[PDB]
């Protein structure tokens, strides 16, 4: 029931695109997909219908060509926590820990990167020995992933001058084609493969520095002693399925005694005066 849902939740704003709130009363659907996440206090304008911001490219993309509702509500700061987790597998494969940030702070990415299966932010130490200028750290990369691409070249008089790829950083690099990390944009219901890793601070096994991860930011979500959360409801299927609502005229009306009215009690019709009487010959199924 939409009434109880809007009453039990501190609803601040609600708007459904490609779907009107009038037809919701007494309709049926096939399935409902619900997404929710807190609202950072810096990108309030990104949650609008249509924006090429960082949230729509790294965090989550909202579909426009489908009937979907958007809700913005608030939650008290008492007995609440935020689960900050990075779903990137290849980032945590090389020894990624935790964000280690203060409470009531949400993390949002500004640029989403992606790599292939054959990727290792680690150079072959047998080649780095013949390097003198801009010598990157190297270690043993696990099998299945090729080492970092580095070439030794002489310009005018420097024999041991080794240059690698992804310089200086994958965010702002001079040759994105030579760097395997490629900037990608998340799709409709698709997570980001991971953030950027500075290969100059990587490299025992190849263990990148925790400060070498770039492309993220943190921001508080406290407003009027409450946390703001945005949710998206996608209703797949219309006028069909087995997911309906009781928002019709049958909304648990109040009984009355004295005048005979129409009857619809468990598939039975008729009229008759009601009279209250104390009876105890009923059962659970009766």
């Amino acid at each position: 029931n939409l009434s109880t849902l809007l009453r039990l939740v501190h609803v601040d704003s609600f708007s459904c695109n490609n779907l009107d709130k009038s037809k919701i009363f007494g309709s049926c659907f096939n399935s409902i997909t619900v997404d929710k996440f807190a609202i950072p206090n810096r990108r309030r304008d990104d949650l609008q219908l249509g924006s090429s911001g960082f949230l729509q490219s790294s965090n989550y993309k909202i579909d426009i060509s489908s009937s979907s509702c958007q809700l913005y509500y608030s939650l008290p700061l008492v007995n609440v926590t935020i689960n900050n987790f990075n779903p990137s597998s290849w980032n945590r494969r090389y020894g990624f820990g935790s964000f280690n940030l203060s409470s009531y702070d949400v993390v949002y990415s500004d640029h989403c990167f992606s790599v292939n299966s054959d990727f290792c932010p680690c150079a072959d130490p047998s080649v780095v020995n013949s390097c003198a200028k801009s010598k990157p750290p190297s270690a043993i990369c696990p099998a299945g992933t090729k080492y970092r691409h580095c070439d030794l070249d002489t310009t005018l008089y420097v024999k041991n001058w080794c240059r690698c790829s992804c310089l200086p950083d994958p965010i702002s690099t001079y040759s994105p084609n030579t760097c395997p990390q490629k900037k990608v944009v998340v799709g409709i219901g698709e997570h980001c493969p991971g953030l950027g890793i500075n290969e100059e601070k990587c490299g025992s096994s190849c263990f990148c520095s925790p400060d070498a991860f770039l492309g993220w930011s943190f921001d508080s979500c406290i407003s009027n002693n409450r946390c703001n959360i945005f949710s998206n409801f996608i209703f797949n299927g219309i006028n069909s399925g087995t997911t309906c609502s009781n928002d019709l005229l049958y909304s648990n009306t109040e009984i009355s005694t004295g005048v005979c009215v129409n009857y619809d009690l468990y598939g039975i019709t008729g009229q008759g005066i009601f009279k209250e009487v104390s009876a105890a010959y009923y059962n659970n199924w009766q």
């Binding site: 200028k133 801009s134 310009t155 005018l156 240059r163 310089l167 001079y174 040759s175 084609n177 030579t178």
Partner: protein, 237 residues
């Protein structure tokens, strides 16, 4: 030239190739019909005796004669403050004994005047007879390429050259690669379009390979030594 195309027989009469021992070595540019501007690294001590040198102009495919039909070089003048270690002030001049009368497909390029105020990311064209992809042979046909100009401050990055570009030098091309000149494209006319005319503002001296990342093209700045060339005119007569 990597990533370019074959140069059609249009109007580019500022490319003169200097041949010694009946083999192509380098090219050059002309500003007046009495001198040829080229690089100074090909005028080393083993490359003395300028009498055994010929010049070819207005010739796209390098097969029209054999030990003949050329112009003999009279005297070659190199820059006095030339260093072979850092490759600074790589400008050389050659004088021909022929009048070089103007004809079809024969038109020199004017020298750049001081105070041009050129744009930082300026578009220019390069041409020459060099390798095709990497460590190749001399191209039989004439090819050209289009490059962009990058500032000296960005070129002095520690990951590109680590402050090895003199103020009398410049960098151009693309940082992503695939557009660069290989070994053999010495000299070369680096002309830019302005006021509906071409200005020669470059001179190739050296380079770290071709079509490689973080290795753009290096060119000589003749605007500082332009008046010096005028000084050489005082030695003409």
């Amino acid at each position: 030239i990597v990533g370019g195309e074959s140069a059609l027989p249009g109007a580019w009469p500022w490319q003169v190739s200097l041949h010694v021992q009946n083999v192509h070595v380098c090219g050059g540019s002309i500003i007046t019909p009495e001198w040829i501007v080229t690089a100074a690294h090909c005028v080393e001590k083993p490359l003395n005796n300028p009498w055994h040198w010929t010049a070819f102009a207005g010739i796209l495919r390098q097969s029209f004669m054999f030990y003949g039909a050329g112009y003999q070089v009279e005297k070659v003048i190199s820059h006095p403050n030339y260093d072979s270690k850092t490759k600074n002030n790589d400008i050389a001049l050659m004088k021909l004994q022929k009048p070089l009368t103007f004809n079809d497909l024969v038109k020199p390029v004017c020298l750049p005047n001081p105070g041009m105020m050129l744009q930082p990311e300026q578009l220019c064209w390069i041409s020459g007879w060099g390798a095709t992809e990497e460590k190749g042979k001399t191209s039989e046909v004439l090819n050209a390429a289009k490059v962009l100009l990058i500032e000296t401050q960005r070129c002095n990055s520690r990951y590109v050259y680590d402050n090895l570009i003199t103020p009398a030098m410049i960098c151009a091309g693309f940082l992503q690669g695939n557009v660069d000149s290989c070994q053999g494209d010495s000299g070369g006319p680096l002309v830019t379009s302005k006021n509906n005319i071409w200005w020669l503002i470059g001179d190739t001296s050296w380079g770290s390979g071709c079509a490689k990342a973080y290795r753009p093209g290096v060119y000589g700045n003749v605007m500082v030594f332009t008046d010096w060339i005028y000084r050489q005119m005082r030695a003409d007569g």
